[PDB]
Amino acid sequence: GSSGSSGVSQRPFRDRVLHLLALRPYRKAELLLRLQKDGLTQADKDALDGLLQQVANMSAKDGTCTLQDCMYKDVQKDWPGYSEGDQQLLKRVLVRKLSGPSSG
């Protein structure tokens, strides 16, 4: 929502993945195919592996990446990626992550 229509390509790369994981845990292969749908190159593929470990946590058994708790603070609600079912889903997620118990 900036000029004419809305597009995800116009948005950076960190945001493209920051929003994907924001919803639910996304794996390397699963997230790769998701980004590839809009546009993914060799520079984004390799960079993704290093970005996920930074803006996400990977398990040594399951094989899925989960967005951090503080990283959620850098998440918007007007993301072209979402629409309705995804937006509402992110709401309950933001609550569990952002603003919670005293320490934990």
Side-chain angles (χ1 to χ4, degrees):
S2 313
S3 268
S5 300
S6 329
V8 188
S9 285
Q10 233 157 42
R11 312 273 193 186
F13 187 74
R14 217 138 200 284
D15 284 334
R16 270 154 99 191
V17 188
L18 179 70
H19 273 104
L20 273 155
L21 300 157
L23 290 176
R24 57 228 234 80
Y26 268 104
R27 316 107 70 80
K28 266 275 286 157
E30 250 189 60
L31 188 79
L32 272 170
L33 290 146
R34 228 304 217 170
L35 290 169
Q36 227 202 327
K37 273 175 142 143
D38 271 340
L40 180 85
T41 72
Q42 278 244 241
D44 303 38
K45 255 210 70 162
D46 268 66
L48 183 80
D49 190 40
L51 224 92
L52 275 163
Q53 301 266 253
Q54 272 168 67
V55 295
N57 279 260
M58 181 196 275
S59 202
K61 270 148 220 280
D62 294 58
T64 309
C65 270
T66 66
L67 188 97
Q68 315 211 346
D69 305 47
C70 55
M71 289 301 309
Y72 269 112
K73 304 226 219 143
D74 270 38
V75 188
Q76 305 181 130
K77 259 205 92 61
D78 216 286
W79 186 248
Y82 312 138
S83 208
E84 191 234 62
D86 286 333
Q87 281 190 54
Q88 277 258 122
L89 178 56
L90 191 92
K91 269 262 238 300
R92 46 167 127 283
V93 186
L94 290 150
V95 188
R96 305 273 213 174
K97 311 274 183 170
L98 318 182
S99 212
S102 212
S103 205

